[PDB]
Design a protein around this ligand. Structure first.
Ligand SMILES: O=C(NCC(=O)c1ccccc1)Nc1ccc2nnsc2c1
Ligand SMILES: O=C(NCC(=O)c1ccccc1)Nc1ccc2nnsc2c1
Lengths: 298, 298
């Protein structure tokens, strides 16, 4: 229940979806809409208000029972039908749908995300000429300098209340951190490492490699690499909607994902820093930079 | 691994144990010490430095493997022996111990606490005339007024992006919240509801009822009841050690536990507010106040 309240209070997330739906009613007017992982059913109710003919909300979680009561309190049961279960298992009362909407995104976009479900739903249920929203996603990396925070996580273990705990460093390094970053600590321009169009993407496309270049903007000690993602509502929209989960933008519940570097190294403003990143499916992230390679998990 | 780092950075917690051990070396000098749920082994190393003859550190968790390396880095393996497993299952290389030390405390003292293990260890392994530390614990309640935070959790659901979500209130109310309270929001003197001496306490004593009286100190709307605990190191100490996890004291990782009231009600400064609390074994907490009864869990 906690997460749903948090997600609803995430204004950037929820109002982006609201605006997309309300400002593009033509996408919904008299349409059949599927809401994959509907939670409390908020997106389905948006879709109904924007003039959807039928809305099907699917979720495996016990939140669905609350969704049912919520739909009744708003007198929408004649438009919105809720079904408990995994999208891959449930039986729908229609063969095809016109529009798929979902808030599926995880930390670093892909960690524990529902994208597999959305893609499954797209392939089985989306009608010819149909649409999936949000339709476009990108992932970006950005270099960080924060010697003090690095010291708090790493050098910290050298002397703990007068005792050596150095071996613990090996255990902190592989754990990606979900946290809001001070944007002043960013020492490079961002670099996109992934672009996903939900209309063309397959499940195999979610495991990917990318070479990247970080355009350094401040001479400093690089201590970590941060990742985040942008969400776009584009196809057939008169009013496009974008939101970023990056540190230069208002915080969201996704915050940013931080991959700590074991051995910080100096960089110079104007320098082009090259590395390589690979994502495998929980998810892991393999980072090569400055001739070090580390695999991270969440 | 995260929790252990957090616990080590909890200065109030860790330095209280450090001071108790270092400032009362007579309790440890040439003694056999058992450390129940030893984690990284920090308390065992304190005990060794204070002059323990042998220290046995027990933990079921994979952190024990790190503890082993930590003990070696500090060259303490001739004094400290670590054993993986539950205290109720493992075989010890001694029949009896002189001193038991443990950091076992949970949120609201008893939520997911290791006290059962400590009591088991006391009964099976503590020698006649031996000691357990910390030896004394208390739990306290205190009344809270925070109409704004109450509105953020409850009235919030009346209108969510133009839709009714009132039914969700029933789901938020029973969930106790772990959070640091602004001490200005406290509207009563604290009232102790439980006193535990680890030398005399049994497992059945941890399920308890208490009538309480809250001495109201500010005329206001009571919106929640908060709970916390105090830890005492007393038996045979020349230098006693106390720490509180209450909101009038420096925050600890235990923060405070907050039980929201569904129907806030007004109180007057000087008023003696009577209620009843009962704890059952996860743990639940049943609260009667102002002729309402609610059971809470974590
Ligand atoms: O590592 C964290 N946060 C996690 C943290 O403080 C923590 C504390 C106790 C237990 C586990 C994690 N943040 C962070 C942010 C930016 C950074 N830049 N260079 S290193 C670094 C670390
Ligand atoms: O309820 C919370 N905190 C939990 C919270 O803000 C939250 C936010 C999103 C999801 C789950 C919990 N705190 C709190 C503190 C003091 C109070 N006094 N009267 S009501 C009250 C609530």
């Amino acid at each position: 229940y906690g997460i749903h309240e948090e997600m609803l209070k995430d204004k950037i997330r929820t109002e982006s979806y609201r605006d997309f739906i309300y400002q593009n009613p033509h996408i919904f007017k008299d349409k059949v809409v599927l809401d994959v992982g509907c939670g409390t059913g908020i997106l389905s109710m948006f879709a109904a208000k924007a003039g959807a003919k039928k809305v099907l909300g699917v979720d495996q979680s016990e939140i669905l029972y609350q969704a049912m009561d919520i739909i009744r309190l708003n007198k929408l049961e004649d438009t919105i039908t809720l079904i408990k279960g995994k999208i891959e298992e449930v039986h729908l009362p229609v063969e095809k749908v016109d529009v798929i909407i979902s808030e599926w995104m995880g930390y670093f976009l892909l960690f524990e995300s529902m994208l597999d479900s959305v893609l499954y739903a797209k392939n089985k249920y989306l009608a010819k000429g149909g649409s999936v929203y949000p339709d476009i996603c990108t992932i970006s990396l950005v270099a960080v300098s924060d010697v003090n925070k690095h010291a708090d996580r790493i050098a910290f273990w050298d002397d703990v209340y007068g005792f050596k705990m150095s071996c613990m460093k090996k255990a902190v390094i592989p754990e990606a951190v979900v946290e809001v970053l001070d944007p002043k600590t960013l020492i490079s321009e961002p670099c996109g490492i992934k672009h996903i169009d939900c209309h063309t993407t397959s499940i195999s496309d979610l495991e990917f490699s990318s070479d990247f270049t970080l355009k350094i903007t401040r001479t400093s000690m690089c201590t970590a690499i941060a990742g985040y993602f942008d969400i776009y509502f584009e196809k057939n929209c008169h009013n496009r909607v974008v939101f970023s989960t990056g540190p230069q933008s208002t915080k969201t519940h996704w915050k940013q994902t931080v991959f700590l570097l074991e051995k910080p190294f100096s960089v110079k403003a104007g320098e082009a820093l090259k590395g390589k990143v690979t994502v495998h499916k929980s998810l892991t992230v393999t980072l090569t930079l400055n001739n070090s390679t580390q695999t991270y998990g969440l």
